[PDB]
Amino acid sequence: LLSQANEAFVRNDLQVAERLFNEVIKKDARNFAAYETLGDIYQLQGRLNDCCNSWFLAAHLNASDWEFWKIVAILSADLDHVRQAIYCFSRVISLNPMEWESIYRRSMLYKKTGQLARALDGFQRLYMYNPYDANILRELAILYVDYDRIEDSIELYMKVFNANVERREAILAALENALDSSMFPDINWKKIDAKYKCIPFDWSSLNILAELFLKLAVSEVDGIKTIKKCARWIQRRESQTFWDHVPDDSEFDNRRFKNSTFDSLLAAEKEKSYNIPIDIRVRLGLLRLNTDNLVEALNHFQCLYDETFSDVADLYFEAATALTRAEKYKEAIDFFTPLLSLEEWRTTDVFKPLARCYKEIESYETAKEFYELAIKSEPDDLDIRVSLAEVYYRLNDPETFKHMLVD
């Protein structure tokens, strides 16, 4: 008689029908289809949560419809209750270990909740399933950094690199043979694209590496030697091994024409990109400035001068502030000073260090001017005081006692 009570109800749609549909199974508890009916209605009336708790129960009657949990999990993630969402996802995954979507989604709700041990052990898995997804690669590289392992995040991009070298050698030996047998060569790609596949290494990759060598802040000379080996492989210059054995950091500069072995190179090779993109070059500057080589770091930063200024202002600033932190003051002022011309940069952010730089070179006259401008926008004490110390050193005490108390 139960089956009749439910049947009459399920057939047709009215707001009284579906709750009375619950009332019969209210006598005795469990019907899987009962809930799937419930959710269908709650979803339509447009109130989200009741829809979730109905289905969220349904999924327990049949533990085995995992396409179903995945829906209940993405809905608990949509309604912003996470602990359910990760739990539902974890059933989808105990049923199906290879479900990619749910391992990923779950493992990034793991990230938001800040269980990294789980979220890492999570993206690692997807990266095992498919090594060639670039999104997964980044997401994994990132967690490694947040998890305070930079060293692992670097090896990760290094393999991608080598994988690209192995593959280029394959294609080069491939058509070195194709001409012997044989009117052009025909290389068989289906065999190549299957045999060596790893993700393309382009400048973006090398930049992502560069930033990883900064965050490490260790053995910074090894980082530089490598940024150069890779940047050199790109631009098909890997042929020239010698650059590995000189300190100058001299390639990627005109300095390379004073080179003994370079001169002897034929014209074909002499013409090839010896230049590197700016976001990376400013990163070699920083990376050198870490080793307190200001002479080399400077030659990199000086390259900002050849880029259209409005395009990279933020780099001028980052360099200037990097010199300020590295306590090289005479030079910082040179990468601060241009930001002044563009209106949006005139702020305490630029004005404080500019001044402090001047105060530090023992020219206090001009340093006054900036702390003043800086004090205007922002009412802060820390850098009003340092303005006293400036009115102190250039003006000696006579008629400086009034100013001090005034401020």
- The domain limits of the chain are 146-180+187-199, 202-303
- Decide if 347 contacts 336 (C-beta within 8 A): no
Give the N- to C-terminal CA distance of the chain in Å, as an integer: 91
Distances (CA, A) of 40 to 31, 54, 65, 85, 91: 15, 10, 17, 19, 22
Residue located via tokens 């006259």: 365
Residue 264 phi/psi, 5-degree rounding, is -65, -20
C-alpha span between 334 and 339 (Å, rounded) = 10
CB 339, CB 316: distance < 8 Å: yes
Contacts of 139 (CB under 8 A, 6+ apart): 108, 123
The tokens for 108 are: 């990034």
Structure-block tokens of residue 21: 């549909």
The CA distance from 336 to 313, in Å, is 10
Q: How was this structure determined?
A: X-ray
Nearest to 77 by CA among 87, 92, 68: 87
Whole-number Å distance between alpha carbons of 109 and 396: 62
- Which alpha helices (H) appear in 182-293, and where do they start and end? 189-195, 203-216, 220-233, 260-264, 267-270, 278-289
Residue 201's CB is within 10 A of a number of other CB atoms, namely 21
Cα gap 374→55, rounded to integer Å: 60
Q: What is the DSSP string of 194-220?
A: HHS-PPP--HHHHHHHHHHHHHH-SSH
Task: Count other Cβ atoms within 10 Å, centred on residue 262.
Answer: 18
Judge whether 285 and 301 are in contact, CB under 8 Å.
Answer: yes
Phi, psi of 149 (to 5 degrees): -115, 100
User: Nearest CA to 38 among 65, 8, 18?
Assistant: 18
Q: How far apart are CA 98 and CA 335, in angstroms?
A: 52
User: What is the Cα–Cα distance from 375 to 126, expressed in whole angstroms?
Assistant: 53
Give, for 236, the enclosing helix (H) or strand (E): none
CB atoms within 10 A of CB 287: 25
At what resolution in Å was this solved?
A: 3.4
Total Cβ atoms within 10 A of residue 216: 18
What's the rounded Cα separation, in Å, for the pair 233 and 223? 16
Dihedral of the alpha carbons of 338, 342, 347, 351, in degrees to the nearest 10? 20
